[PDB]
Structure 1
Amino acid sequence: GVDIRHNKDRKVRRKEPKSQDIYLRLLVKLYRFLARRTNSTFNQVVLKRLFMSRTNRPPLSLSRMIRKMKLPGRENKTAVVVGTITDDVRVQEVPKLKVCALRVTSRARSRILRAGGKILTFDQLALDSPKGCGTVLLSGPRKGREVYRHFGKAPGTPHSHTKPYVRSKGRKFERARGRRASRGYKN
């Protein structure tokens, strides 16, 4: 018997993971071939994302897309999103560009086509270019959801800045002791 230790035998980054509705499953059955037989690391990463769960593919907000596609050197390039695109009302300037995302919200689609860009579904993209050829790739922010302000150092430690779970925000809920040196001690 060897003396290796086994607790890291199996890599949890699963290989053919959760893939449940036929459209996404068929997209995978398509890009799997490209990932095997094309050195384009871009296809490796795109396919590796087509497995992730929705909490790991947050929605690419269109204002973010605009201010990340405006940057120099990135003219006439398709900007590709693995999540989905939700339009923003923080932006008044009609868009200018050409996307390629899984699902795009109706408002954002209206405004893109009004802008005169294009919408590309991943089949359209693959037949357009069998690999990354002048394609920028983005992602909506993934430290965005609420529960991250709950995570971290447990509140009550000297220098956390995390959000406890309380059922309101009133003055009487947690702010009693351990919060103000007028009531015993502060964090």
Structure 2
Amino acid sequence: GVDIRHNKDRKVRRKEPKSQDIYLRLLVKLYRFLARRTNSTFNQVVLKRLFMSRTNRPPLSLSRMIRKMKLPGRENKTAVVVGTVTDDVRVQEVPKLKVCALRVTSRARSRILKAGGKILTFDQLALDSPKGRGTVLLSGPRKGREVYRHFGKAPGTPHSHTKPYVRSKGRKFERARGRRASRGYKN
């Protein structure tokens, strides 16, 4: 007998996409090869994000892509997101962008192209940037989901700003006892 624990032997991590999409799996075949046969860590990161689930691939808005592609030294670099590029109506002017994405919404496509930009697919990124050179890999906000408002210390604990689960919002819905000192206590 060997003195060892086995509860952590199996690592919980995706080796492939749960999706049965045949176009996504053709891109995984592509980047499985590039990640294996090139020393480029960029390929490994993209291969990993192709396995990732829907909530681990948040959409990247147009306004946020412009901000991150406007930092100094990022001129003529292709912005890359393994996800969806959504349009942002709060933007007034779109610059000339070169972007690679899994999906670009219909209105984001017109605005990027109308500014003189180029929209790639990941099979076109490989031919243009086999090792990922001259790229800017970008991610959407992962905690930008309604669930993360409900996580943390339970709402009924001191200095807990977690959001409760209420069927309705209003004066009659979880506001008397425990939420104001006038009714029992507050914390």
Q: Which TM-score bucket, shorter chain as reference? A: over 0.9
8 Å CA contact 2:60–2:86 kept in 1: the answer is yes
Q: CA deviation at 1:178?
A: 0.4
8 Å CA contact 2:59–2:85 kept in 1: the answer is yes
String of CA shifts for 1:94-121, please: whole Å, max 9, x gaps. Answer: 2321101010000000001100010100
8 Å CA contact 1:153–1:162 kept in 2: the answer is yes
8 Å CA contact 1:59–1:86 kept in 2: the answer is yes
Give % identity: 98
8 Å CA contact 2:14–2:52 kept in 1: the answer is no
Q: CA deviation at 1:64?
A: 0.4
* TM superposition score normalised by structure 1: 0.98
Runs of 4+ in 1 over 4 A off after TM superposition: none
Q: CA deviation at 1:78?
A: 0.3
Q: Distance in 1 between matches of 2:46 and 2:110?
A: 26
Q: CA deviation at 1:23?
A: 0.2
Q: Distance in 2 between matches of 1:36 and 1:98?
A: 26
8 Å CA contact 1:58–1:140 kept in 2: the answer is yes
Q: CA deviation at 1:16?
A: 2.6
**Structure 2 unmatched ranges of 5 or more:** none
Q: CA deviation at 1:131?
A: 0.9
8 Å CA contact 1:95–1:111 kept in 2: the answer is no
Query: What SS is found at the alignment partner of 2:16?
Result: coil
Q: Matched residue pairs, number?
A: 187
* TM superposition score normalised by structure 2: 0.98
Q: CA deviation at 1:14?
A: 2.6
Q: CA deviation at 1:168?
A: 1.3
**Structure 1 unmatched ranges of 5 or more:** none
Out of 94-103 and 119-128, give the one that drifted further.
Answer: 94-103
Q: Distance in 1 between matches of 2:81 and 2:170?
A: 41
| RMSD of aligned residue pairs (Cα, Å) | 0.8
8 Å CA contact 2:98–2:117 kept in 1: the answer is yes
Structure 2 counterpart of 1:107: 107
8 Å CA contact 1:155–1:161 kept in 2: the answer is yes
Query: What SS is found at the alignment partner of 1:110?
Result: helix
Q: CA deviation at 1:167?
A: 1.1
Q: Distance in 2 between matches of 1:141 and 1:16?
A: 23
